[PDB]
Amino acid sequence: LPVEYLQVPSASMGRDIKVQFQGGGPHAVYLLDGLRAQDDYNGWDINTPAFEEYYQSGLSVIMPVGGQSSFYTDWYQPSQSNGQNYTYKWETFLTREMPAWLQANKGVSPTGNAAVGLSMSGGSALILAAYYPQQFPYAASLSGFLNPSEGWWPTLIGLAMNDSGGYNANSMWGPSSDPAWKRNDPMVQIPRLVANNTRIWVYCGNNIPAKFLQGLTLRTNQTFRDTYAADGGRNGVFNFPPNGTHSWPYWNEQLVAMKADIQHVLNG
């Protein structure tokens, strides 16, 4: 019932990962952070009443802390030019290390949870559900990058990572020809989301190099929707309100709006 700050060892990253945690039930909502995930608090707790909004929801809430520009993925190597001295292994942490710890210590089930991501982690949430459907029957992407391997996206993602911490996308998924780019591309993995009957919730809202990027993000999100439908997808909620914005107030509004949806999927 009270909010806790936990030190959860990551063998794969060789350090302790801080996790903000609120109990409330055996199944949990994993709230993933944006591109500039900080090392002190998860952006959901900094900017929104997420914990309060899900208090007595019958769901636990998990906010991992850290991982700027990590895309919550397992990297090939430490990011070279910014002096990172370990390899990001956030997929291993989120799918093995952390749920094991939460199961042993708190009784949180490793299966039957929801992954909710925004910006950077919007794609991550869908990828986690794509490859770990037992752990995540539910996944939400708010203003996510849903076709990272395609067109200009590897270039833009590389620039974004440089402009947030000096991280280098080549250390993460290799050059854009590397199979890791398509492996971690939600668009490309839509057949998995359909085959798994994943419940997905996709949101996207709407100085001129930003006009381009804002437009590209929404249009890519629209192609994702169409392709999901075309591939036989029938378990999706697609929210593209024209006045929607790419900001914590609307991301929080989406988190609130999906609560009933998550409750019915995870606890129904």
Q: Please choose, from the candidates 34, 54, 52, the residue with its C-alpha nearest in 3D space to the C-alpha of residue 43.
A: 34
CATH architecture classification, 1-268: 3-Layer(aba) Sandwich (3.40)
- Contact status, residue 71 vs residue 172, Cβ threshold 8 Å: yes
Q: Which two tokens stand for residue 111?
A: 């299966």
Give the end-to-end CA distance of the chain in Å, rounded to a whole number: 22
User: CA angle 5-10-16, nearest 5°?
Assistant: 40
CA distance 112 to 20: 20
Q: Which residue is it, tokens 């790419």?
A: 246
DSSP type of residue 93: I
Give the strand pairing for 138-142 and 15-22. Answer: unpaired
Burial class of 155 by CB neighbour count within 10 A (0 to 12, 13 to 18, 19+): exposed
Q: Which two tokens stand for residue 234?
A: 């029938």
Q: Order across the sheet with 15-22: list the strands.
A: 4-10, 15-22, 60-64, 28-31, 114-118, 138-142, 199-203, 236-239
The technique by which this structure was obtained is: X-ray
Give the strand pairing for 138-142 and 199-203. Answer: parallel
Q: Please choose, from the candidates 29, 58, 177, 238, the residue with its C-alpha nearest in 3D space to the C-alpha of residue 117.
A: 29
**Alpha helices of the chain — where are they, by DSSP H?**
43-47, 50-54, 90-92, 98-106, 120-131, 153-163, 169-173, 179-183, 190-195, 209-230, 248-257, 259-267
CA distance 122 to 205: 13
- Contact status, residue 61 vs residue 54, Cβ threshold 8 Å: yes
Q: Which residue is it, tokens 């019932």?
A: 1
Residue 93 has a CB neighbour count (10 Å cut-off) of 26
Q: Which two tokens stand for residue 54?
A: 């899900």
Annotated domain spans of the chain: 1-268
Burial class of 50 by CB neighbour count within 10 A (0 to 12, 13 to 18, 19+): buried
Residue 223 has a CB neighbour count (10 Å cut-off) of 14
Resolution (A): 1.9
State residue 17 phi and psi, 5-degree precision: -105, 125
Q: Please choose, from the candidates 125, 119, 147, the residue with its C-alpha nearest in 3D space to the C-alpha of residue 221.
A: 147
